[PDB]
Design a protein around this motif. Structure first.
Motif, PDB file in Angstrom:
ATOM      1  N   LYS A   1       0.803  -1.216   0.000  1.00 49.10           N
ATOM      2  CA  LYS A   1       0.000   0.000   0.000  1.00 49.10           C
ATOM      3  C   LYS A   1       0.837   1.268   0.000  1.00 49.10           C
ATOM      4  O   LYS A   1       0.533   2.201  -0.747  1.00 49.10           O
ATOM      5  CB  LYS A   1      -0.942   0.010   1.213  1.00 49.10           C
ATOM      6  CG  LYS A   1      -1.877   1.206   1.271  1.00 49.10           C
ATOM      7  CD  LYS A   1      -2.699   1.197   2.549  1.00 49.10           C
ATOM      8  CE  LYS A   1      -3.687   2.352   2.583  1.00 49.10           C
ATOM      9  NZ  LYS A   1      -4.696   2.250   1.494  1.00 49.10           N
TER      10      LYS A   1
ATOM     11  N   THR B   1       0.583  -1.520  -5.870  1.00 48.02           N
ATOM     12  CA  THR B   1       0.669  -0.678  -4.688  1.00 48.02           C
ATOM     13  C   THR B   1      -0.306   0.492  -4.813  1.00 48.02           C
ATOM     14  O   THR B   1      -1.111   0.565  -5.748  1.00 48.02           O
ATOM     15  CB  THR B   1       2.105  -0.192  -4.482  1.00 48.02           C
ATOM     16  OG1 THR B   1       2.395   0.860  -5.410  1.00 48.02           O
ATOM     17  CG2 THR B   1       3.082  -1.330  -4.705  1.00 48.02           C
ATOM     18  N   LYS B   2      -0.240   1.408  -3.852  1.00 52.25           N
ATOM     19  CA  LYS B   2      -1.058   2.613  -3.857  1.00 52.25           C
ATOM     20  C   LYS B   2      -0.238   3.892  -3.853  1.00 52.25           C
ATOM     21  O   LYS B   2      -0.550   4.821  -4.602  1.00 52.25           O
ATOM     22  CB  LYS B   2      -2.008   2.612  -2.649  1.00 52.25           C
ATOM     23  CG  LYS B   2      -2.958   3.796  -2.598  1.00 52.25           C
ATOM     24  CD  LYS B   2      -3.788   3.777  -1.325  1.00 52.25           C
ATOM     25  CE  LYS B   2      -4.790   4.919  -1.297  1.00 52.25           C
ATOM     26  NZ  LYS B   2      -5.792   4.803  -2.392  1.00 52.25           N
ATOM     27  N   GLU B   3       0.808   3.965  -3.033  1.00 52.34           N
ATOM     28  CA  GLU B   3       1.684   5.129  -2.969  1.00 52.34           C
ATOM     29  C   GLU B   3       3.128   4.652  -2.973  1.00 52.34           C
ATOM     30  O   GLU B   3       3.528   3.874  -2.101  1.00 52.34           O
ATOM     31  CB  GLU B   3       1.403   5.973  -1.722  1.00 52.34           C
ATOM     32  CG  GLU B   3       0.029   6.621  -1.695  1.00 52.34           C
ATOM     33  CD  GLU B   3      -0.187   7.475  -0.461  1.00 52.34           C
ATOM     34  OE1 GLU B   3       0.732   7.550   0.381  1.00 52.34           O
ATOM     35  OE2 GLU B   3      -1.277   8.073  -0.333  1.00 52.34           O
TER      36      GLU B   3
ATOM     37  N   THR C   1      -0.441   1.106  -9.868  1.00 51.50           N
ATOM     38  CA  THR C   1      -0.380   1.944  -8.682  1.00 51.50           C
ATOM     39  C   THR C   1      -1.368   3.102  -8.814  1.00 51.50           C
ATOM     40  O   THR C   1      -2.163   3.168  -9.758  1.00 51.50           O
ATOM     41  CB  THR C   1       1.047   2.447  -8.458  1.00 51.50           C
ATOM     42  OG1 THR C   1       1.334   3.506  -9.377  1.00 51.50           O
ATOM     43  CG2 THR C   1       2.041   1.323  -8.674  1.00 51.50           C
ATOM     44  N   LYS C   2      -1.325   4.014  -7.848  1.00 45.78           N
ATOM     45  CA  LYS C   2      -2.159   5.209  -7.859  1.00 45.78           C
ATOM     46  C   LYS C   2      -1.355   6.498  -7.840  1.00 45.78           C
ATOM     47  O   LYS C   2      -1.671   7.426  -8.589  1.00 45.78           O
ATOM     48  CB  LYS C   2      -3.123   5.190  -6.662  1.00 45.78           C
ATOM     49  CG  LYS C   2      -4.089   6.362  -6.617  1.00 45.78           C
ATOM     50  CD  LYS C   2      -4.933   6.327  -5.354  1.00 45.78           C
ATOM     51  CE  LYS C   2      -5.950   7.456  -5.334  1.00 45.78           C
ATOM     52  NZ  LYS C   2      -6.937   7.332  -6.441  1.00 45.78           N
TER      53      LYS C   2
ATOM     54  N   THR D   1      -1.497   3.869 -13.732  1.00 42.74           N
ATOM     55  CA  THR D   1      -1.453   4.698 -12.539  1.00 42.74           C
ATOM     56  C   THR D   1      -2.451   5.847 -12.669  1.00 42.74           C
ATOM     57  O   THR D   1      -3.240   5.913 -13.618  1.00 42.74           O
ATOM     58  CB  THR D   1      -0.032   5.214 -12.301  1.00 42.74           C
ATOM     59  OG1 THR D   1       0.251   6.283 -13.210  1.00 42.74           O
ATOM     60  CG2 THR D   1       0.975   4.102 -12.518  1.00 42.74           C
TER      61      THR D   1
END
Lengths: 72, 72, 72, 72, 72, 72, 72
Positions: free
Chosen positions: D35, E34-36, F34-35, G34
């Protein structure tokens, strides 16, 4: 973490190596299925095959290092 | 963590190595199915095959290191 | 983290290496299926095959390093 | 993180290397299905095959480094 | 992060390399799903094959570096 | 992040390299699905094959660097 | 981020290279699928094959660099 040095005034070195198929690991953090994995490095990590330091610190030197970790 | 040094005024060294198939591990943190895995390094870690230090600290030197860990 | 140095006034070095098939890893953070993975480096990391430091710090030098980590 | 240096007034170095098939990794952050993945570097990272420093800091030098990490 | 230097007044160096098939990685942040993913660099990263520094800092030099990270 | 230098008044260096099939990577941020992917560089990144610095900082120099990251 | 330098008054350097099939990457931000991908550079990035700096900063120089990142 107070450090100080002072200096006032008024030879063959040999390292040899011969390596085949050499695997070197330094700081390793291997894990599976965790939640928090933190690796904090604030000192001095030397990795390699021939880590040689010869005639270091001829004069005045300071290697004052401070590390911390807060978990609340 | 107070350190100090002072200096006032008024030879062959040989290391040899011969290695085949050499595996070296330093600090290792291997785990499975954990929750918190922390590896804090704040000192001095030297890894390799030929870790040689010759005639170090000729003059004044300070290696004052401080580490900490807080868990609440 | 106070560091200071002072200096007032009024030889063959040899390193040799011979490596075949050499794999070197420094700081490694390998994980699977985690949530938070933090790698904070604030010191001095030297990686390679022949990490050689010869006759360093002839005069005055300071390597004062400070690291921190806050988790709330 | 206060650092200072002062200096007042009033030899063959040899490193040799021979490598075939050499893989070197420095700081590595490998992960899967996470995360938050943060890699903060604020010190000094040297990567390569022949990381050689010879006769550094002849006079006065300061390498004062400060790093931080806040997580709330 | 205060740094200062001062200097008042009133030799063959050799590095050799020979490498075939050499892969070098410095700071690596590899992840999947993932996210960040943040990679903050504010120090000094040297990557290559022959990272050589010879007779650096003849006079007065300051390498004062400060890094930070805020997450709320 | 205050840095200063001052200087008041009143040798063959050799680096050689020979590489075939050499792949060098510096700062790498590889990810999938991802973000937010942020790569902030504010220090000094040197990439190449022969990263050589010889007799740098003859006089007075300051490399004061400051980096930051705010996430709310 | 205050930097200053001052200087008051009152040798063959050799780098050689020989490379075939050389691929060098500096700062790399590779991602797939992303939402936000930001690459902020405000320091000093040197990429190439032969990144050589010889006898730099003869007199007084300042490389004061400041970077920032705000995310709310």
């Amino acid at each position: 973490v107070v450090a100080a040095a002072e200096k006032t005034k008024q030879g063959v070195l040999y390292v040899g190596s011969k390596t085949k198929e050499g695997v070197v690991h330094g700081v390793a953090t291997v894990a599976e299925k965790t939640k928090e994995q933190v690796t904090n490095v604030g000192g001095a990590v030397v990795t390699g095959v021939t880590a040689v330091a010869q005639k270091t610190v001829e004069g005045a030197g300071s290697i004052a290092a401070a590390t911390g970790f807060v978990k609340k």
